Amino acid sequence: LPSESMKVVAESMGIAQIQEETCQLLTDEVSYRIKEIAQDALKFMHMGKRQKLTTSDIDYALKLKNVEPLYGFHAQEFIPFRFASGGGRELYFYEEKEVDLSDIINTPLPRVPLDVCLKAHWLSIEGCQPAIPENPPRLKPRSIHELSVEQQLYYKEITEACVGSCEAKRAEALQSIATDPGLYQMLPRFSTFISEGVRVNVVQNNLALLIYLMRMVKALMDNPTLYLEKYVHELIPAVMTCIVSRQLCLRPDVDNHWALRDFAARLVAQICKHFSTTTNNIQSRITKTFTKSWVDEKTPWTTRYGSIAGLAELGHDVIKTLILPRLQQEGERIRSVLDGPVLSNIDRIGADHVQSLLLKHCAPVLAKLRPPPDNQDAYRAEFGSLGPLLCSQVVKARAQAALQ
């Protein structure tokens, strides 16, 4: 240790005018005791099998050398505090050095973790390591398929379970897709089965077939082992079709699910724009297709509602800028559905869903950038769509923020 730190300590104690040989005598004695303890604290690190040298190793190394592990305070009578340590304090250099005494009481205590249990598994089966989650990772000859027959049978069982005849079968197959480590090298056949399926499954609008395939896409995405952005060029136009397509079946009975089909598709769409991101290829391409779906005149209202759902779930900054200028076209579309008597078509249902989603999204956008003053009739400057009900939604959001 440096001697110019030992003279600062001495003159801040009342011992002034110390010589350099007196001061060098202090810094070779205490630097030996640090070296004697750190060599002795490495014994507790090597028998604790942790190669870490935690803060408690010096507490036992001090107690071994008959020195109290008491730090920051030394009791000359020893009777109140013996060789038991006080685990020091939580330290940071960047601390506040003054807290309020009721701030420490009102904070929630951390959760005591689970107790130690003994689980057994298999490192090796007769020499081979299994891929369980407890483990880390002139005629030309007749060729063999690159899948095994156990793997091909597994693919057949998982695909016949993922078409959702039974719900428990689906859910396991979805978890099996979500965490099989060896599901690479089978992934082309899964991507092709998804893509091909949606395209011949929108020829007749079979909603379950589609809701099961979208859940299969979601189960494919959250698997951490497999490399997906080689196959996302097949995955993205499948989800795009699910959100922006018309429904060939009866829309009114399942339009509630249809909103969820567009709900699940817009979730996985913004999750795909969150991952796999490079410069100006994926997110901007689907944003441009969503905007030209919106600005297109005389749309199908199923497509229009799907395009709205897609443009709505894109995050914080997207919605505010995109909706701002449109504050009139949406209202005019709602007014046309209202005026024309035609009720047996799906136009009225599409209009109500679109208006509710646009209004609900507007409430956070308004709650997010501006105070909640004049929540009664100022929204009449924005054609009076949600008005006081929008203000009530903003108030509910403020109450949720207060609860947080």
Partner: peptide, 25 residues
Amino acid sequence: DLLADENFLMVTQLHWEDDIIWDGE
């Protein structure tokens, strides 16, 4: 850097939006 493998993956080089079935009939 324009020779990076991703540039050549066909998700970043294909107008796959055109595929999404728009009111198929």
